[PDB]
A paper describes a structure:
The bacillamide biosynthetic pathway is a common, three-protein system, with a decarboxylase that prepares an NRPS substrate, an NRPS, and an oxidase. The oxidase is shown to perform dehydrogenation of the thiazoline in the peptide intermediate while it is covalently attached to the NRPS, as the penultimate step in bacillamide D synthesis. The oxidase forms a stable complex with the NRPS and dimerizes it. We visualized co-complexes of the oxidase bound to the elongation module of the NRPS using X-ray crystallography and cryo-EM.
The structure of BmdC shows it to be a dimer of di-domain protomers. A single copy of BmdC is present in the asymmetric unit, and the adjacent symmetrically related copy completes the biological dimer. The small N-terminal domain contains 96 residues and features a winged helix–turn–helix motif (wHTH) with a very small β-sheet. A DALI41 structural similarity search reveals this domain to be similar to the precursor peptide recognition elements (RRE) in ribosomally synthesized post-translationally modified peptide (RiPP) processing enzymes with Z-scores ranging from 5.3 to 6.5 and rmsd values of 2.0–2.9 Å over 61–69 alpha carbons. BmdC contains a 45-residue loop segment between the RRE-like (RREL) and Ox domains, that wraps around the Ox domain of the other protomer. The loop contributes 1764.3 Å2 of the total 5777.3 Å2 per-protomer surface area buried by BmdC dimerization. The electron density maps showed very strong density for flavin mononucleotide (FMN). One protomer contributes to most of the side-chain interactions, with both the FMN phosphate, (through Arg145, Arg146 and Ser147) and the catalytic isoalloxazine rings (hydrogen bonding of Arg149 with FMN N1 and O2, Asn236 with N3 and O4, plus Gly294 with N5; analogous to interactions observed in flavin reductase P51). The conserved active-site Tyr260 points toward the FMN in each protomer. There is room for the thiazole ring to bind between this Tyr260 residue and the catalytic FMN N5 atom; a glycine from the crystallization buffer is observed occupying this site.
Numbering used by the authors:
A (entry chain A), B (entry chain A): 2 to 324
């Protein structure tokens, strides 16, 4: 019925001359009298009305204004946090020995990378075992690259697309089995796909939920579409060229009832497993993929009609390779 | 020189009749007068001496006792949190609609699983696209299973072991390349291996750092060993039989200088990619693997001589398959 909000675990606070600092923002007005009790109260799970009844005492317009802002600013949340918010506090614990100019200079960055690729563990002793370089590895593994340019004219055949997604399907064989591992065998990653118009034979544009039990796509949304402004600038041409987008979504209901918060962590690992498994079948079918770290997931989540117990973990752009 | 402690982002607090509640524990004595200022002060990064100078005012033995306990209880920490602590607060946000008896009953669990494997997205419309089941998938992918019984007599040949780990090595080819994807191409997962005595041809028992630039093992620790009590009960026979253990470690210094906290999240995905990539080469070489979700990583971290900027993400047991 009514929405229940919690104090975000990712948000810590502090008093100021200016007001109450929560996260990276300072807040003003009534809220200064509300603390510390407001922090204690909000951790228990409370509605907006119960917050007003407990703290309003004065302009009820002025109180809704600061609550509206704590929801806007994600200090009060309705469900599990998406991964960006889960991890954000770790910035405050990592002491960075490099200069911030790594992020602003392709020349400073090119240097940081070559240094990290030649790193070694500090606690190493002066003994070594040189392994044999000779051995032969599967070509689907060794030739896989991050593909950022696709054939924008030839449609992905329905067979190729079907074959790609059968890597993620179920197999009934004395017991249900997948082609990839999963903590508890709970397989709590919901898989969704956005297909661009005319780019996949047999699949109208839209957002679809991949059902691994049927090996089917089930329509979710044909009204909205993904655009380039939903992508970080560095990725917009990748998206422009891609034929489809895969979205890996954690269903907390498929995991936390058994593993608690550790299941969310396990689902982040499982997201990698799925990406790697897909990326190998792709190379077999001369499909290219590119992982996307970040995107306007706030919008995608709304297009996919996700619930409080579902969050987007990862995204992948795909399509036929040129030539 | 001196150690600098931060208030753990994973820890929230509350006042009580009994005392100050921090995390799932209530604390007593001097600490009740120290709040709220102690919370504000500790977020900035402070030494033990500066804490004493600012709050002692009284029994300095009684103050070291509560600080010793806040460090023991991980309320005050020296670096990035390991994944279990990163995620733990999410339990407080997930509203569980199932009974807790899922965790205590193999019959309640067997039922929760079959229900989650037949789940569907709630926002689905009544349209479907049935994909072709026909397509053929690589056998290294389709036949891969979680292997929990190994040949404990035949040693993994040095060639097989070398070939397995070349999936994780670098390749100089106009530019440095790996066989698997990584955000920013920073490859911030340090790979370590524990080898049991007599179980891998050419590799003495011990902990080793895998250097992907040389394709070498570099000794870290031959004194300590992993034992069964370092494993969850459910996994102890898996470990007992395995020939070696792989540990995937996030080097925050190889990632956060560029991506901030998001690089830690990306490294959790990358851990999956690595596990899947390894698990495919393994199947090619008739090596079995099993992922381990949890283990006494507090001990392993010490055996690997990790620094504040390194945390263990995942573990894998491996060895030759029976017959
Ligand atoms: C992140 C992760 C953690 C896992 N942890 C464990 C574990 O602690 N113990 C275990 O026996 N298996 C573990 N597994 C293996 C799964 O139980 C297994 O993948 C699942 O039962 C499906 O079986 P399959 O690999 O044979 O398809 C783990 C898998 C993943 C992806
Ligand atoms: C978690 C993750 C996120 C990624 N995000 C992006 C991205 O946002 N943009 C991009 O161009 N590439 C992205 N990539 C691809 C990497 O940049 C790529 O794997 C790396 O440069 C190594 O190249 P290779 O795949 O050709 O070996 C991502 C990879 C991973 C594993």
């Amino acid at each position: 019925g009514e929405q229940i909000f919690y104090w975000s675990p990712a948000k810590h606070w502090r008093m100021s001359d200016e007001g109450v600092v929560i996260g990276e923002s300072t807040y003003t007005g009534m809220i200064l009298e509300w603390f510390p009790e407001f922090y204690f109260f909000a951790q228990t799970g409370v509605t907006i009305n119960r917050l007003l009844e407990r703290f309003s005492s004065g302009s009820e317009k002025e109180a809704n204004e600061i609550l509206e802002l704590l929801i806007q600013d994600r200090v009060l949340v309705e469900g599990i946090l998406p991964p960006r918010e889960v991890f954000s506090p770790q910035e405050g614990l990592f002491v960075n020995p490099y200069s911030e100019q790594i992020r602003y200079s392709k020349e400073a960055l090119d240097y940081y990378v070559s240094e990290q690729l030649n790193r070694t563990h500090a606690a190493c002793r002066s003994t070594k075992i040189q392994l044999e370089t000779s051995g032969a590895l599967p070509d689907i593994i060794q030739k896989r690259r991050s593909c950022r340019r696709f054939d924008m004219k030839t449609p992905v055949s329905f067979a190729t697309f079907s074959n790609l997604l059968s890597s993620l399907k179920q197999r009934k064989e004395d017991k249900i089995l997948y082609n990839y591992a999963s903590a508890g065998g709970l397989y709590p990653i919901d898989v969704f796909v956005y297909v661009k118009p005319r780019r996949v034979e047999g699949v109208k544009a839209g957002f679809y939920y991949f059902n691994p039990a049927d090996h089917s796509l089930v329509l979710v949304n044909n009204i909205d579409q993904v655009i380039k402004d939903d992508h970080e600038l560095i990725n917009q041409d990748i998206f422009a060229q891609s034929a489809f987008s895969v979205y890996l979504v954690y269903n907390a209901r498929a995991s936390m009832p058994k593993y608690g918060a550790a299941g969310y962590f396990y689902a982040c690992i499982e997201a990698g497993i799925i990406t790697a498994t897909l990326n190998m079948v792709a190379e077999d079918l001369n499909v290219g993929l590119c992982s996307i770290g970040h995107m306007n997931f706030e919008e995608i989540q709304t297009f996919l009609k996700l619930e409080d117990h579902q969050v987007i973990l990862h995204a992948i752009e795909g399509g036929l390779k040129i030539d």
